[PDB]
Amino acid sequence: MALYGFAQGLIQEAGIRIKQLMEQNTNVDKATEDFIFDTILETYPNHQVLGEEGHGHDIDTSKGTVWVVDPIDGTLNFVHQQENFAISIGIYIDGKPYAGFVYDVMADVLYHAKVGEGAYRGSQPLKPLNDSNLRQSIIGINPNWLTKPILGEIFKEIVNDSRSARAYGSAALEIVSVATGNLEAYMTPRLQPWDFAGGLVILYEVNGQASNLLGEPLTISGPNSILVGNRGLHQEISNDYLEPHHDALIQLHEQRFK
Amino acid sequence: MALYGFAQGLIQEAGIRIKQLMEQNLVTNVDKATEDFIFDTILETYPNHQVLGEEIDTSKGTVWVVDPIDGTLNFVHQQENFAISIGIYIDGKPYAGFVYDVMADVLYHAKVGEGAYRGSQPLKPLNDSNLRQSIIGINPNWLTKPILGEIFKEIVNDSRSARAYGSAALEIVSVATGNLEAYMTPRLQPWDFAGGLVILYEVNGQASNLLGEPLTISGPNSILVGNRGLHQEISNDYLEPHHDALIQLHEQRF
Ligand SMILES: O=P([O-])([O-])O[C@@H]1[C@H](O)[C@H](O)[C@@H](O)[C@H](O)[C@H]1O
Ligand SMILES: [Ca+2]
Ligand SMILES: [Ca+2]
Ligand SMILES: [Ca+2]
Ligand SMILES: [Ca+2]
Helix, strand or coil, rough: CCCHHHHHHHHHHHHHHHHHHHCCCCCHHHHHHHHHHHHHHHHHCCCCCEEEECECCCCCCCEEEEEEEEEECCCCCCCHHHCCCCCCCCCCCCEEEEEEEEECCCEEEEEECCCHHHHHHCCCEEECCCCHHHHCCCCEECCHHCCCHHHHHHHHHHHHHCCEEEECCCHHHHHHHCCCCCCCHHHEEEEEEHHHHHHHHHCCCCEEEEEECCCCCCCCCCCECCCCCCCHHHHHHHHHHHHHHHHHHHHHHHHHCC | CHHHHHHHHHHHHHHHHHHHHCCCCCCCHHHHHHHHHHHHHHHHHHHCCEEEEEECCCCEEEEEEEEEECCCHHHHHHHCCEEEEEEECCCCEEEEEEECCCCCCEEEEEECCCEEEECCCCCCCCCCCCCHEEEEECCHHHHHHHHHHHHHHHHHHCCCCEEECCCCHCCCCCHHHCCCEEEEEEEEEEHHHHHHHHHHHCCCEEEECCCCCCCCCCCCCEEEEECCCHHHHHHHHHHHHHHHHHHHHHHCHH
């Protein structure tokens, strides 16, 4: 509770500093990451921090309390739109998720969740997810994946059965879209642990389901591909449109994560 | 100003009604409600005027080009990111445009020659960009289509990133406001783009179909909108080389 409370005020303080550096006027990702790393260590010197801008690569992430932070998820959105970016924080203890935070800084909306205690949009509880079929589902997927040698071709059937397709440019906020019901599913061939660590606690708290594109479970020990959705639509995307291309997807997987 | 004022009031009042129908309940009839309300109210007050919408010589007289709800799939699935869109034309000429992001509470609007607004605030004129530093609006569905896919692949690969929001009217506005540097699709009806185009043109934006032909309200078309620079660039470096292929499609589609 002290940890949750401490973490909730940290991510809020980090948002204030982000707006300071904007109203005034990459260094900004560095600034915010250093703030969060330094603030965590000051109170908890034996916690570890897995960060994108260069904290904790080659730490056994299953040992102790681990903070997995993306200080600005959606930097292109940050640069080009001045909005639609998130601070993402996931706290794991002894390799087991405890809490997840995804803060839409410019909307001023904090999405949060404690394992077993449901998920929230600020003060509002989020509803459990209902199953959907692919043919009545909006899916999160970027156009860039569809132009890729053999992965493109595998994703085109999914795009075409899907009711429609969207792309927001923040993996953390797109996972939270699935958690809030704004998207039925979201998928990508490459994410790092800092991109999903926070969003996954929230997703799991509304009965969503996550795996990589081969159905294998996700963890913070490394990068991976991503399939997230409601359970029913996860079964359908994995079972129908991915498992038939297992061998191609395996070879792809071993090429990306080598 | 009289007509402009009428239109501004009417679209704001339509959005209010949309919400009353959400607070008490769904898309099919809400859509019908909003069409009836807008068409009926225009035709009572200006019965000489034409109203073009989903359910005529557009060079003659005053023409209202109306999408009561653009982004119906977002309406159903997200309960947000959908817009009411109204283009007004007088004697074949743009007069006014309105795109009302109902749930976000933001009316984008403009009278031709007079600037574009977000509520009461003026919008900034657009600056040029290069595709390779540009975020583009293109739906993944267009990447999967037989000859479209290969024409669009190269543009997606060179752009900094791509995005898809699911509302043509709001994606054109996103271009008008600096959020996307360009937006493109192979088909769109007059009511999807009429409002947005007026707004776009007032920030020094730039629209054509995918063959570079100018956009009119006389029928459906494909769409390329952007700041002037990256419009020139997308059309001449990436679309020009497939003119004949794009024409076959245009003729095959329209
Ligand atoms: O650089 P960054 O904005 O923190 O992170 C990126 C965002 O999540 C983006 O939407 C996704 O497409 C990329 O795969 C990520 O790398
Ligand atoms: Ca980042
Ligand atoms: Ca990221
Ligand atoms: Ca419509
Ligand atoms: Ca429409």
